[PDB]
Design a protein around this motif. Structure first.
Motif, PDB file in Angstrom:
ATOM      1  N   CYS A 210       0.822  -1.198   0.000  1.00 51.00           N
ATOM      2  CA  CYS A 210       0.000   0.000   0.000  1.00 51.00           C
ATOM      3  C   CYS A 210       0.862   1.257   0.000  1.00 51.00           C
ATOM      4  O   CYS A 210       2.024   1.242   0.403  1.00 51.00           O
ATOM      5  CB  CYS A 210      -0.927   0.006   1.208  1.00 51.00           C
ATOM      6  SG  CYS A 210      -0.108  -0.445   2.749  1.00 51.00           S
ATOM      7  N   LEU A 211       0.266   2.358  -0.448  1.00 54.90           N
ATOM      8  CA  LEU A 211       1.011   3.602  -0.572  1.00 54.90           C
ATOM      9  C   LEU A 211       1.236   4.250   0.785  1.00 54.90           C
ATOM     10  O   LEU A 211       0.384   4.196   1.674  1.00 54.90           O
ATOM     11  CB  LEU A 211       0.277   4.581  -1.478  1.00 54.90           C
ATOM     12  CG  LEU A 211       0.073   4.191  -2.936  1.00 54.90           C
ATOM     13  CD1 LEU A 211      -0.410   5.386  -3.730  1.00 54.90           C
ATOM     14  CD2 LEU A 211       1.359   3.653  -3.518  1.00 54.90           C
ATOM     15  N   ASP A 212       2.398   4.875   0.931  1.00 50.50           N
ATOM     16  CA  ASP A 212       2.705   5.617   2.143  1.00 50.50           C
ATOM     17  C   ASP A 212       1.866   6.885   2.207  1.00 50.50           C
ATOM     18  O   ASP A 212       1.583   7.513   1.186  1.00 50.50           O
ATOM     19  CB  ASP A 212       4.194   5.954   2.186  1.00 50.50           C
ATOM     20  CG  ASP A 212       4.579   6.796   3.387  1.00 50.50           C
ATOM     21  OD1 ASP A 212       4.993   6.209   4.408  1.00 50.50           O
ATOM     22  OD2 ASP A 212       4.482   8.040   3.311  1.00 50.50           O
ATOM     23  N   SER A 213       1.479   7.267   3.425  1.00 54.79           N
ATOM     24  CA  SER A 213       0.555   8.379   3.600  1.00 54.79           C
ATOM     25  C   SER A 213       1.229   9.724   3.363  1.00 54.79           C
ATOM     26  O   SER A 213       0.703  10.564   2.625  1.00 54.79           O
ATOM     27  CB  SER A 213      -0.047   8.329   4.998  1.00 54.79           C
ATOM     28  OG  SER A 213       0.803   8.978   5.923  1.00 54.79           O
ATOM     29  N   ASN A 214       2.380   9.956   3.974  1.00 59.66           N
ATOM     30  CA  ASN A 214       3.005  11.274   3.973  1.00 59.66           C
ATOM     31  C   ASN A 214       3.895  11.400   2.745  1.00 59.66           C
ATOM     32  O   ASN A 214       5.100  11.163   2.814  1.00 59.66           O
ATOM     33  CB  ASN A 214       3.808  11.494   5.231  1.00 59.66           C
ATOM     34  CG  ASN A 214       3.056  11.104   6.466  1.00 59.66           C
ATOM     35  OD1 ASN A 214       1.938  11.555   6.692  1.00 59.66           O
ATOM     36  ND2 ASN A 214       3.659  10.244   7.274  1.00 59.66           N
ATOM     37  N   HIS A 215       3.299  11.790   1.624  1.00 58.42           N
ATOM     38  CA  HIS A 215       4.078  12.178   0.461  1.00 58.42           C
ATOM     39  C   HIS A 215       3.369  13.313  -0.253  1.00 58.42           C
ATOM     40  O   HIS A 215       2.146  13.441  -0.190  1.00 58.42           O
ATOM     41  CB  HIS A 215       4.311  11.024  -0.511  1.00 58.42           C
ATOM     42  CG  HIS A 215       5.271  10.003  -0.003  1.00 58.42           C
ATOM     43  ND1 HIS A 215       6.571  10.310   0.334  1.00 58.42           N
ATOM     44  CD2 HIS A 215       5.128   8.677   0.215  1.00 58.42           C
ATOM     45  CE1 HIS A 215       7.182   9.219   0.756  1.00 58.42           C
ATOM     46  NE2 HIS A 215       6.332   8.212   0.685  1.00 58.42           N
ATOM     47  N   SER A 216       4.153  14.137  -0.935  1.00 63.58           N
ATOM     48  CA  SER A 216       3.571  15.292  -1.597  1.00 63.58           C
ATOM     49  C   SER A 216       3.056  14.946  -2.983  1.00 63.58           C
ATOM     50  O   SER A 216       2.043  15.495  -3.418  1.00 63.58           O
ATOM     51  CB  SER A 216       4.594  16.417  -1.684  1.00 63.58           C
ATOM     52  OG  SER A 216       5.822  15.933  -2.188  1.00 63.58           O
ATOM     53  N   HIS A 217       3.753  14.082  -3.715  1.00 65.79           N
ATOM     54  CA  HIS A 217       3.341  13.751  -5.070  1.00 65.79           C
ATOM     55  C   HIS A 217       3.647  12.292  -5.359  1.00 65.79           C
ATOM     56  O   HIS A 217       4.630  11.742  -4.859  1.00 65.79           O
ATOM     57  CB  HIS A 217       4.028  14.645  -6.102  1.00 65.79           C
ATOM     58  CG  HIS A 217       3.699  16.092  -5.944  1.00 65.79           C
ATOM     59  ND1 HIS A 217       2.572  16.662  -6.490  1.00 65.79           N
ATOM     60  CD2 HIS A 217       4.316  17.072  -5.244  1.00 65.79           C
ATOM     61  CE1 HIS A 217       2.526  17.940  -6.161  1.00 65.79           C
ATOM     62  NE2 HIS A 217       3.571  18.213  -5.402  1.00 65.79           N
ATOM     63  N   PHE A 218       2.802  11.677  -6.177  1.00 66.88           N
ATOM     64  CA  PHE A 218       2.885  10.258  -6.480  1.00 66.88           C
ATOM     65  C   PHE A 218       3.030  10.058  -7.976  1.00 66.88           C
ATOM     66  O   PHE A 218       2.254  10.614  -8.759  1.00 66.88           O
ATOM     67  CB  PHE A 218       1.648   9.532  -5.976  1.00 66.88           C
ATOM     68  CG  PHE A 218       1.703   9.208  -4.529  1.00 66.88           C
ATOM     69  CD1 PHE A 218       2.636   8.316  -4.051  1.00 66.88           C
ATOM     70  CD2 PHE A 218       0.843   9.819  -3.642  1.00 66.88           C
ATOM     71  CE1 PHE A 218       2.697   8.018  -2.711  1.00 66.88           C
ATOM     72  CE2 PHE A 218       0.899   9.527  -2.301  1.00 66.88           C
ATOM     73  CZ  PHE A 218       1.828   8.626  -1.836  1.00 66.88           C
ATOM     74  N   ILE A 219       4.017   9.262  -8.367  1.00 65.99           N
ATOM     75  CA  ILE A 219       4.221   8.875  -9.755  1.00 65.99           C
ATOM     76  C   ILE A 219       4.319   7.361  -9.792  1.00 65.99           C
ATOM     77  O   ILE A 219       5.159   6.773  -9.103  1.00 65.99           O
ATOM     78  CB  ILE A 219       5.473   9.528 -10.351  1.00 65.99           C
ATOM     79  CG1 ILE A 219       5.195  10.994 -10.641  1.00 65.99           C
ATOM     80  CG2 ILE A 219       5.875   8.841 -11.631  1.00 65.99           C
ATOM     81  CD1 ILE A 219       4.012  11.197 -11.548  1.00 65.99           C
ATOM     82  N   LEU A 220       3.457   6.730 -10.577  1.00 61.58           N
ATOM     83  CA  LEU A 220       3.348   5.282 -10.608  1.00 61.58           C
ATOM     84  C   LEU A 220       3.668   4.778 -12.005  1.00 61.58           C
ATOM     85  O   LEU A 220       3.104   5.257 -12.987  1.00 61.58           O
ATOM     86  CB  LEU A 220       1.945   4.856 -10.201  1.00 61.58           C
ATOM     87  CG  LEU A 220       1.438   5.527  -8.924  1.00 61.58           C
ATOM     88  CD1 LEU A 220      -0.007   5.167  -8.652  1.00 61.58           C
ATOM     89  CD2 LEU A 220       2.314   5.168  -7.744  1.00 61.58           C
ATOM     90  N   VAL A 221       4.570   3.809 -12.100  1.00 61.05           N
ATOM     91  CA  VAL A 221       4.972   3.276 -13.392  1.00 61.05           C
ATOM     92  C   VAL A 221       4.556   1.810 -13.423  1.00 61.05           C
ATOM     93  O   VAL A 221       4.272   1.206 -12.388  1.00 61.05           O
ATOM     94  CB  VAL A 221       6.486   3.459 -13.636  1.00 61.05           C
ATOM     95  CG1 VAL A 221       7.295   2.450 -12.850  1.00 61.05           C
ATOM     96  CG2 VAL A 221       6.834   3.464 -15.117  1.00 61.05           C
ATOM     97  N   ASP A 222       4.484   1.243 -14.628  1.00 57.18           N
ATOM     98  CA  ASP A 222       3.917  -0.086 -14.782  1.00 57.18           C
ATOM     99  C   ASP A 222       4.423  -0.746 -16.052  1.00 57.18           C
ATOM    100  O   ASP A 222       4.907  -0.086 -16.973  1.00 57.18           O
ATOM    101  CB  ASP A 222       2.396  -0.026 -14.829  1.00 57.18           C
ATOM    102  CG  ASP A 222       1.895   0.607 -16.096  1.00 57.18           C
ATOM    103  OD1 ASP A 222       2.502   1.601 -16.547  1.00 57.18           O
ATOM    104  OD2 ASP A 222       0.886   0.124 -16.642  1.00 57.18           O
ATOM    105  N   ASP A 223       4.283  -2.069 -16.094  1.00 54.24           N
ATOM    106  CA  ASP A 223       4.433  -2.834 -17.322  1.00 54.24           C
ATOM    107  C   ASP A 223       3.227  -3.724 -17.577  1.00 54.24           C
ATOM    108  O   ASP A 223       3.385  -4.852 -18.054  1.00 54.24           O
ATOM    109  CB  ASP A 223       5.712  -3.673 -17.295  1.00 54.24           C
ATOM    110  CG  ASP A 223       6.910  -2.912 -17.812  1.00 54.24           C
ATOM    111  OD1 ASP A 223       6.703  -1.902 -18.512  1.00 54.24           O
ATOM    112  OD2 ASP A 223       8.054  -3.335 -17.548  1.00 54.24           O
TER     113      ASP A 223
END
Lengths: 465, 284, 88, 19
Positions: A210-223
């Motif tokens: 699961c994603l961490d709560s305290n972050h300012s911006h999220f960038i998710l990459v995939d295949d």
């Protein structure tokens, strides 16, 4: 809208695949993320990217608050693996309202959780704020809620709700895998924009992190995949080779953006990550006391090229993963021997944060000794080093680091040389540097030329009257 | 300033051991008797002298050396042999040197300094079993233990309403019956007489001795550990174990529970549970 | 000694109200991995408001007990039944 | 004075290869 540039990376994984280790189906069969090639295409015998994986416009281009953990907003963009690095950098500055940063912090280490001495916690979690508070930095991290990337999210939470200051809004950009995320569902929207939500769940979602709560911006990459962890490594090193390549613009004559790692825990793969950074010429710092491989490289930091063939210092990792020197289930330990012996060879590009005799200096100054130590190692054709470190020293707003480091060697006087830097602090303001240069004989009766004022009045404060 | 110099007043003023534990306690839960303390160097009586002796008190309820509800004889009544299966008093142990030296079967795991009691109701091994009913547990669609890396486990334990722990059926040789029928010491209160192949679909874990508190020198509980695993989380195998749970005449509850090092059973199952957890790579 | 889940970080905090020892609540049972679930702090946030004990409320507001979510309708009905009896 | 006692909080926490 800038939606027509970030693209999907989607295709079926159950054309035909006997990956029945997960018991719910064969291998993510239809009515899943697989939605497009549910009719019959040509053969689909092997899904591998010869069998094409489509790139369509995206569906996670929004903004979600953690319910009900926090209240602030943060941006949600998934991205393909083949996206050019200049596209996302245009996405960050021109569309998320992000300033061009002055340094990069790429915190790496182990994915598993770890607990160290609370003195190290009270030093590292405090000073890492005190980097990005003054400089206006970015903190490239690893995304999810477990491990070293969890501990850096502690430090922002230790500041931005206790001393919750808009002045110095820290920017921590999480780069993770859309596919190791725990709730891929509930976050899709071909509509395009959403001030939506999801709910954090830690104890469930056994493989998908699961994603961490305290972050300012999220960038998710995939295949187009799921469960497979490391897919953001050919993005983050490809991204950071461009942000370190991109320059500043400012009216005081601009710099190249520097870059630094911080390793905390480490382990296998992280040792491959560190020298890959130093071969490209980016220095980084290892912390003492905590770390599987980190305390190893801390131990062999100051010894010369005289190698154990590590087996004495094999089990200095305090967790004893695989529990023994001999049952380590890693044949050819000679592989890790070369990775250490290349790192310790480059004396300039590696420092080590000793707890006892450097913590009272700071962990601020040691993480900023190292960028100054690297740029001292690489100048070309004259006294550009004491021009380049001072060019950095404007953009730090760290006056003592300008004073105590690059004003204690033999400064080549030539006080016309300080004129492209005296012009910087006057426009930027930054008033405290002007007393430093007036200490160093920058004579104001000589400095103020006719053309300097013409450059000066063209760079007023635009919001001023 | 006044709060900070107070922080400087206080700143400058700075210039075999694993044989028995539970059997070696003082209180034994029925009659107030304790008479011999033995530490971790005098435990194996075959090694040291131990000229000091524990005085004896046997059979715990009814008839001290007669044991007619219990089922064993006197020491003057010509104690039955050491490793003989005969007769209905199953004295067939699992360890070899089951020692009847003093005319009475002294224990092989060292002297615990105790009596010869019929807390076991048997002057012997009392070879018992524990049906480790094992749900390799789940979530909404199938989970593992994210705590370290491992797999998280669920185990049915029954909280008996009187004793304050959460236990499993002790298959301790139901009198007149066999070991799969004191399996039904509590499992008769789970209402089914139909399915009887419970350990027939079982997997053996650990044969050997437990640190039971109610032991003594002449009566001690060794056991066999049997796992009954479930990997489906899905169908009739868990369903026939769950739909055959009326629990109609039961005391308190039989609820499914997760495993750790912190479950409310005190000693016996808890030192037995991790051997079941080791076989499937569980978290414990 | 806890049983069946995260009752330990519920039980030590239940003690930590009745100590009025705020640092022992802070330095001990807020430095491990706190299982967040901030509905869990609601039977303890109700404690410090009635007992008063004001210093715990800043500690829970540090830990993301959102007041816009916490104040339910039934909590106020439990709250106004527990006024200071000597008050006006 | 307040800047100088802060300097004392941090002052007392100190206890062939060539081939």
């Amino acid at each position: 809208i800038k939606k027509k540039e970030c693209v999907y990376f989607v295709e079926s994984s159950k054309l035909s695949d006997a990956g029945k280790v997960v018991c719910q189906c064969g291998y993510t069969h239809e009515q899943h993320l697989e939605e497009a090639t549910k009719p019959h295409t040509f053969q689909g015998t092997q899904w591998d990217p010869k069998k094409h994986v489509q790139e369509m416009p995206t569906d996670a281009f929004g903004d979600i608050v953690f319910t009900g953990l926090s209240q602030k907003v943060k941006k949600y963009v998934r991205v393909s693996q083949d996206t050019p690095s200049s596209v996302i950098y245009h996405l960050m500055t021109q569309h998320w309202g992000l300033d061009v940063p002055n340094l990069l912090i790429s915190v790496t280490g182990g994915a598993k959780n770890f607990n160290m001495k609370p003195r190290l916690k009270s030093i590292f979690r405090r000073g890492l704020v005190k980097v990005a508070q003054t400089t206006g930095a970015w903190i490239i991290t690893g995304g999810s809620h477990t491990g070293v990337m969890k501990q850096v999210g502690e430090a922002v939470r230790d500041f931005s709700l206790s001393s919750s200051y808009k002045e110095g809004e820290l920017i921590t950009i999480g780069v993770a895998t859309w596919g190791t995320v725990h709730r891929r569902e509930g976050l899709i929207h071909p509509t395009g924009s959403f001030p939506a939500e999801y709910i954090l769940d830690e104890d469930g979602q056994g493989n998908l992190t699961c994603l961490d709560s305290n972050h300012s911006h999220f960038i998710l990459v995939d295949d187009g995949t799921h469960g497979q962890y490391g897919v953001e490594i050919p993005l983050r090193t490809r991204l950071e080779k461009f942000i370190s390549e991109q320059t500043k613009e400012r009216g005081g004559v601009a710099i190249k953006i520097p870059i630094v790692c911080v390793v905390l825990e480490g382990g296998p793969g992280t040792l491959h990550t560190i020298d890959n950074a130093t071969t490209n010429g980016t220095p980084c710092v290892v912390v003492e006391g905590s770390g599987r491989v980190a305390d190893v490289i801390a131990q062999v930091a100051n010894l010369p090229v005289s190698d154990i063939t590590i087996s004495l210092i094999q089990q200095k990792l305090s967790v004893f993963f695989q529990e023994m020197f001999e049952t380590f289930t890693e044949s050819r330990i000679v592989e890790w021997t070369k990775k250490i012996q290349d790192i310790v060879r480059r004396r300039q590009l590696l420092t080590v944060f000793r707890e006892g005799k450097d913590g009272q200096q700071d962990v601020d100054v040691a993480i900023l000794q190292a960028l100054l130590k690297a740029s001292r190692s690489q100048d070309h054709f004259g006294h550009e080093n004491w021009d380049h470190q001072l060019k950095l020293a404007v953009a730090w707003n760290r006056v003592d680091i300008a004073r105590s480091e690059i004003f204690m060697d033999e400064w080549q006087w030539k006080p016309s040389d300080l004129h492209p830097t005296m012009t910087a602090a006057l426009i930027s303001n930054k008033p405290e540097f002007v007393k430093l240069f007036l200490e160093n004989g920058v004579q104001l009766k000589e400095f103020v030329t006719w053309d300097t004022l013409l450059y000066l009045y063209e760079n007023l404060d635009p919001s001023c009257l | 300033i006044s709060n900070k110099v107070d922080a400087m007043v206080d700143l400058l003023d700075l210039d075999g051991d694993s044989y028995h534990v539970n059997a070696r306690h003082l209180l034994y839960p029925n009659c107030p008797v304790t008479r011999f303390p033995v530490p971790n160097e005098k435990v194996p009586w075959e090694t040291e002298f131990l000229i000091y002796d524990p005085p004896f008190y046997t059979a715990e309820r009814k008839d001290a050396a007669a044991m007619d509800p219990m089922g064993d004889t006197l020491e003057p009544l010509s104690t039955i042999q050491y490793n003989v299966v005969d007769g209905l008093r199953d004295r067939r142990s699992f360890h070899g040197p089951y020692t009847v030296q003093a005319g009475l079967p002294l224990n092989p795991m060292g002297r615990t300094g105790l009596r010869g009691r019929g807390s076991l109701s048997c002057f012997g091994p009392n070879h018992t079993l524990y049906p480790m009913v094992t749900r390799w547990r789940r979530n909404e669609d199938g989970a593992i233990c994210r705590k370290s890396i491992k797999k998280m486990l669920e185990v049915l334990v029954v909280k008996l309403p009187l004793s304050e722990h959460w236990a499993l059926p002790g298959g301790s040789r139901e009198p007149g019956e066999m070991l799969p029928r004191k399996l039904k010491r509590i499992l008769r209160q789970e209402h089914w007489p139909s399915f009887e192949n419970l350990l027939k679909c079982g997997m053996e874990v650990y044969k050997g001795y437990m640190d039971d508190p109610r032991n003594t020198d002449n009566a001690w509980i060794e056991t066999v550990a049997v796992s009954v695993h479930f990997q489906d989380q899905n169908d009739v195998e868990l369903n026939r174990l769950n739909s055959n749970l009326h629990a109609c005449d039961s005391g308190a509850s039989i609820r499914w529970q997760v495993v750790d090092r912190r479950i409310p059973l005190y000693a016996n199952h808890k030192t037995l549970l991790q051997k079941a957890a080791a076989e499937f790579g569980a978290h414990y």
